Design a protein around this ligand. Sequence first.
Ligand SMILES: Nc1ncnc2c1ncn2[C@@H]1O[C@H](COP(=O)(O)OP(=O)(O)NP(=O)(O)O)[C@@H](O)[C@H]1O
Ligand SMILES: Nc1ncnc2c1ncn2[C@@H]1O[C@H](COP(=O)(O)OP(=O)(O)NP(=O)(O)O)[C@@H](O)[C@H]1O
Ligand SMILES: Nc1ncnc2c1ncn2[C@@H]1O[C@H](COP(=O)(O)OP(=O)(O)NP(=O)(O)O)[C@@H](O)[C@H]1O
Ligand SMILES: Nc1ncnc2c1ncn2[C@@H]1O[C@H](COP(=O)(O)OP(=O)(O)NP(=O)(O)O)[C@@H](O)[C@H]1O
Ligand SMILES: [Mg+2]
Ligand SMILES: [Mg+2]
Ligand SMILES: [Mg+2]
Ligand SMILES: [Mg+2]
Lengths: 290, 292, 292, 292
Amino acid sequence: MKIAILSRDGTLYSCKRLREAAIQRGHLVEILDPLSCYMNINPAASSIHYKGRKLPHFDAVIPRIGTAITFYGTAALRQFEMLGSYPLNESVAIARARDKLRSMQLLARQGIDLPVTGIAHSPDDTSDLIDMVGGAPLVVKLVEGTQGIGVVLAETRQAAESVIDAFRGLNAHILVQEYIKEAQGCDIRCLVVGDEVVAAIERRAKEGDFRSNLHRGGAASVASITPQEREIAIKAARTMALDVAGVDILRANRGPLVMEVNASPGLEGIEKTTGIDIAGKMIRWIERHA
Amino acid sequence: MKIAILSRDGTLYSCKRLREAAIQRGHLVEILDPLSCYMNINPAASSIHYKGRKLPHFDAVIPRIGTAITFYGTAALRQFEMLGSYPLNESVAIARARDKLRSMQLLARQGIDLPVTGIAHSPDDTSDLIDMVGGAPLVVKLVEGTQGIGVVLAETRQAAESVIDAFRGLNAHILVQEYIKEAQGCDIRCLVVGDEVVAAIERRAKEGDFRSNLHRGGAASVASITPQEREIAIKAARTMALDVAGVDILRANRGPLVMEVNASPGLEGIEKTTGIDIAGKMIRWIERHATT
Amino acid sequence: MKIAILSRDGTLYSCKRLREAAIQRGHLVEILDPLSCYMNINPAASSIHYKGRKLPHFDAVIPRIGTAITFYGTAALRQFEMLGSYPLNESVAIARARDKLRSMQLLARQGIDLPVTGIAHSPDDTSDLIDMVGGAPLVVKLVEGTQGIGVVLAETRQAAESVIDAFRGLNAHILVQEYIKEAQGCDIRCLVVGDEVVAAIERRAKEGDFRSNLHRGGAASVASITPQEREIAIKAARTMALDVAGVDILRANRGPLVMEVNASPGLEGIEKTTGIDIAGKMIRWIERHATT
Amino acid sequence: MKIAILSRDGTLYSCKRLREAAIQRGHLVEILDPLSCYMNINPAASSIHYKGRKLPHFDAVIPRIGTAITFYGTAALRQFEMLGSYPLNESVAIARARDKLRSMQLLARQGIDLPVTGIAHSPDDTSDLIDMVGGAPLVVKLVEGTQGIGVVLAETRQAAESVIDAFRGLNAHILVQEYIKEAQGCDIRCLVVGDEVVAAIERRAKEGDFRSNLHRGGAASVASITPQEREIAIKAARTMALDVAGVDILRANRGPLVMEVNASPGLEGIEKTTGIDIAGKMIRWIERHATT
Ligand SMILES: Nc1ncnc2c1ncn2[C@@H]1O[C@H](COP(=O)(O)OP(=O)(O)NP(=O)(O)O)[C@@H](O)[C@H]1O
Ligand SMILES: Nc1ncnc2c1ncn2[C@@H]1O[C@H](COP(=O)(O)OP(=O)(O)NP(=O)(O)O)[C@@H](O)[C@H]1O
Ligand SMILES: Nc1ncnc2c1ncn2[C@@H]1O[C@H](COP(=O)(O)OP(=O)(O)NP(=O)(O)O)[C@@H](O)[C@H]1O
Ligand SMILES: Nc1ncnc2c1ncn2[C@@H]1O[C@H](COP(=O)(O)OP(=O)(O)NP(=O)(O)O)[C@@H](O)[C@H]1O
Ligand SMILES: [Mg+2]
Ligand SMILES: [Mg+2]
Ligand SMILES: [Mg+2]
Ligand SMILES: [Mg+2]
């Protein structure tokens, strides 16, 4: 089979592993920077050009589309889909998953448990919003945030007022979210391929922090996930219409809460922590559905 | 009926006209800034709060969501939808429609005639790209995400090459498009409501300009649209799953080409030029498809 | 005399009132959007063009530059200065005044009394920084370059810690400031023209806020200001090398403290609350210092 | 003496070389991240804290403040200055140098030869602007651009029209500049320390390109600088009151033209291309001008 990996990070571990795994299974592989594809849209069916050349047909495309290029990357992916390529994650679902508020609304509407989460942009009554979510302790987050930057624990009502008031000046969407204190700074990161969780690790915040992000000094280790946790990760991915998804879970008293769904999970940390061949399993899903 | 109009621009002509027409037909109307809505999304479909107060149920919501606020705006609209409010244009269709690339791809894929159009972001062979749409004169449209940056005519291959080179590295993608010179700065805006074109104007670009948008100096006149153009406007609107849309058509030598489908068309120019009660048609659509 | 008013807002009260007042006194006024000015900077001091024409010489220019467009704004003002125009606030002083950190560093170095104020960006010991100013309650001011993001009250040490933590990584710096509650949510906004306070007001935040800001629930009476307070306000304006300046003072047990110096103070609130012709005082100062 | 290097980039080549060179010459050195510095500004000239501790007095500070942090870095620098440290480049001069329009206006007004350079932001007559600068061929570039991104050669009038129209949608300051064809894509980068040029390199653009930037394929070699070019680089640095500066020069038919002045020139390319110990020369300047 002929497989395109659609990513700007072709030098990086996850793309190199997907290429190696596909070649090892006898497939032909090309790594394509989405930003280098250009194409006639009207007329439709028109072939994709790349560095002055006309790309061949690809049986499958593996999109690995950075947050910064979602709109154009999915446009390139959409073109491959119209030419008949099988996509490991559809353009429609990648664009939806990039929309964090929409994704959370969908998850909540389909029965998936999440922390009590309020959304706001320019709220004019800070106390009302704090009470609407249920009072301190609260985690305030910027929706378009990464690496734990703009994610803060407001333990008291006054901290929550001050943080929400300060974030107002930024003209940005925010989450105000119930603090899962009993998780003790740990989250469970599952990687879902198809109908199964293929791998899971635990990420643990440093002492003095509650954010498990690696960039914020988090530590990864092998996890023991429950049947319920497996089930919620698989159901979250299916609800998002993703064939491949990272799902981050917080362990609350009342059960697992889905915190995040990522359409382009990194392979390095979870593969190296667990020893599982995740890239191989992505390739096998492709073999079974293209 | 209780109708919310979702817009930051509650003072502007179109929001006032929608309010006026629904009030005249007996409906209770609130004009709500999406950015002032705050709400629990979990648990599902919790009430929407607004300036210290919890909002009542609305039977319908009219989204007039600004270009710079799609993500939050559509989330607010989606919350109304999960609360049971009927939307004049759904959140999903609105979000898709803001994506010009995705929309042109969908219209082309569904067989609607458009000008020859290539897309690019960081092309590494500009000559190949220009050749893709057949050379200058060309229109280049530059976009950051879904926000339009600008639309320029490039009269020579050199001009087009310079524009594309200029934007390399600026995180903007590029629509390169055949120039419909025979339009001589005129396009045809059809305003679709439900299954009808309810008004149609011809917009004529200023002197020394190809861009006929009234907000740049366009002169508007009433247009007489062929049944071909009328069926194309309605099919363009239905393909995008939009209940209200403005469909811009260029009259090329070979036939009518769709240029743009807009989920939130301005009402002022078209209402004044045609004297049609367009806001009223929108309220009627609501009356016919919303419950209670 | 021929007078240019440099502002994006030739629509709003202050600019119309400045043009009105200047015409009243026999001057020819033109309101010019700085962003519409274009010019050669080399050749040194070339003539400024504007919407297709070469502008005439202006004997004076009144800069009313918006926060958001300082770099081009001051550049255009600088060019007028080089062409010989008299500036009502020159570009060097305007540029320095937009930089709060630098400006307070100047005012304190020049011996004016301010609230205890600390600055930080990504401090690694937030309690050290809070103890630097004397603990909570604190005011925290978030700034991006020269553009204020917001001002908040931290009633506790925990709240202050959390605001600082919240902004780590956001590319904003932080002023931490002793909170003047004995000022009971009210500040004094004096308007300095040259050597005199032309008007002074007590501005009172709504019961429910500490920001005595006028865009946020303005209540304001005519003020009765100390001899020391007149001295201070004029001295603040002059240390900043500003000819026209709003000076906001906070009333403290310790004496009066300068809280802000604004090169481009609004006229509407202050003029109607005092009836004073402040624009007229500005035009007069031009008459007194613009040669011909 | 005790020397602080004020830089985010403590592990990068230039700061390591400065630290090495200062240590070799017997000084005590500390690399300090400006963003980790925090301090009272009122009261004036109190100690600078850093990761919980009070910093000792430094006899000299070497600022290496990135563009994105100009305003906070220079505030930190100013505080060291107020505490008596000698700065290798004063904060006020670094702050002005970050303002490219202001710096070009200053160099031009002081009689330093630059290319003819028009500035614009929202020009409303593209043709008038093009003619004001002198006509095609022109280089159009974003004022805030870096590495040559957003720098484009418009060889013809129509290319210039299209590029300028396209850039207008960015809401950004632009330069429209005489194109120095006879330079053949080479620029001379001089590094001035005090009253001399201590090193110079020629950067030559890749084939088919005119931009000599490293990231656009530029090739560095050792340069043969004329007495005239030496004098202009030193005078350009002196005019902007910088003690250390990179000065980029184009060789035009009429003479050398200053294209750029950088207060924080990188050391790696120029040192490795020439074999000159530049860091040591910066330390030597400090020894000659800083009291211990
Ligand atoms: N409600 C919460 N309760 C407890 N811990 C939380 C909560 N929200 C976030 N965290 C922790 O903070 C980390 C960062 O939050 P997260 O929402 O993942 O933002 P992000 O990583 O910066 N952006 P994204 O890539 O979209 O996840 C999580 O991985 C958790 O360890
Ligand atoms: N291919 C084309 N050929 C001829 N005229 C065109 C073409 N594309 C656009 N125009 C003209 O340019 C005008 C502006 O086009 P348009 O694509 O609608 O951009 P815009 O309204 O200025 N901003 P946006 O609608 O967000 O892209 C149109 O109304 C036409 O009059
Ligand atoms: N230390 C303080 N103690 C008491 N009140 C303060 C203090 N600092 C600021 N305020 C209040 O906050 C208001 C606004 O803060 P300010 O420092 O003026 O920030 P800003 O950039 O000017 N935003 P704004 O003034 O509202 O346009 C002032 O007018 C005061 O009423
Ligand atoms: N007017 C001009 N004539 C000829 N070549 C030019 C001209 N302007 C720029 N160049 C070339 O293009 C390169 C990039 O232009 P430049 O103005 O230096 O922008 P930049 O380096 O990407 N941003 P900056 O860090 O501020 O210098 C220069 O180094 C020259 O090689
Ligand atoms: Mg996360
Ligand atoms: Mg349009
Ligand atoms: Mg103020
Ligand atoms: Mg350069």
